[PDB]
From Swiss-Prot:
Name of the protein described by the UniProt record: Transport and Golgi organization protein 2 homolog
Effect of T70P: In MECRCN; uncertain significance
GO BP terms in the entry: Golgi organization; protein secretion
Subcellular location(s) of the protein: Cytoplasm; Mitochondrion; Golgi apparatus
Superkingdom field: Eukaryota
Native source organism of the sequence: Homo sapiens (Human)
Phylogenetic classification of the source organism: Eukaryota, Metazoa, Chordata, Craniata, Vertebrata
Annotated gene: TANGO2
Keywords: Cytoplasm, Disease variant, Golgi apparatus, Mitochondrion, Neurodegeneration
Amino acid sequence: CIIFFKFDPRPVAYRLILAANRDEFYSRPSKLADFWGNNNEILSGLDMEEGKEGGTWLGISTRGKLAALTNYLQPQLDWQARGRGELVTHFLTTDVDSLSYLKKVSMEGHLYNGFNLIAADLSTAKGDVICYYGNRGEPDPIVLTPGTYGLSNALLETPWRKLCFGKQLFLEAVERSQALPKDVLIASLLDVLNNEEAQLPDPAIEDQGGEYVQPMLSKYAAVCVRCPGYGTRTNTIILVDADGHVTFTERSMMDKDLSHWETRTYEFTLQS
C-alpha cells in the first residue's frame, strides 16, 4: 500500500488532498465504495473476507471523520491475531476524537499484526486534526503538523525509495494542477498512483521484508505494485476543499483482470 496526503487546516486551497493505493492479494473479496452506516453517512469500500466482513482500509464520514490503515511488512504473520480491518471501521462509526481513539488503540496494539493508522477529525469550525499511530513504532500517537506526508508498509515517512519517488510525483501533480478544475487534479493523481517504475535497490525494504519480500522485490518497490496474484487493486483520491466540499474517487480492479476497472466518484459536503 502507499498513501500520500497534503493537509492544511488553515487554507489561505484544499484542506486535504489524499491519494492512496491499496495493495492486496487479488483473491480477497471486496465491495466497491458506497455509502453505508445507520444514517448512510460513511463512505468506503469494504472487506468481504469471510469472518472479517465490514472491515476497511480507508474511509470518510459526512461528519468529518477520516481514517486510513496500511499493513506493516513482516516476514511472518500471527494468524490468531485480531483482524486490522476493524481499526478504521470503529473510528468511523463512533464519536471519539482521533487522538483519544489512537490512544485506546495503542493500549491494544499488541493484539494485531503490524499496522499503521491515520485518524483525522475534519471540522470546518473546530479546525482539522490528523493523528498517527503504528504498533511497530513508538507507543504514543502523535498529532501531525500541516504538511505533505507519505505512508507505505514501514512507518510514517520511512524513506523507502518508492515513497520518496511517489511523494515527488504527488507534489508535482498537485503543482501542475493548481490553476485547473479539480478533474485535472484527480486525473493527475490517478496517473501517479499507476506509476509502475520500480525504485531499486532498496535495502530498507530488503531488511524489513526478509526472505518473504525477496521474490516480490522487483515489483514491490514501485508505487503501483504488479506481483503474481498480488498488487495495487484500488486507487483512491479524497479531496476536501476549503469550504468542506468532499470529492471521493475510487478506481477498482474488476474480475481479477488488469484490463477491467471501475471508477466511482461521489461528492458531498461535510456536516457540522
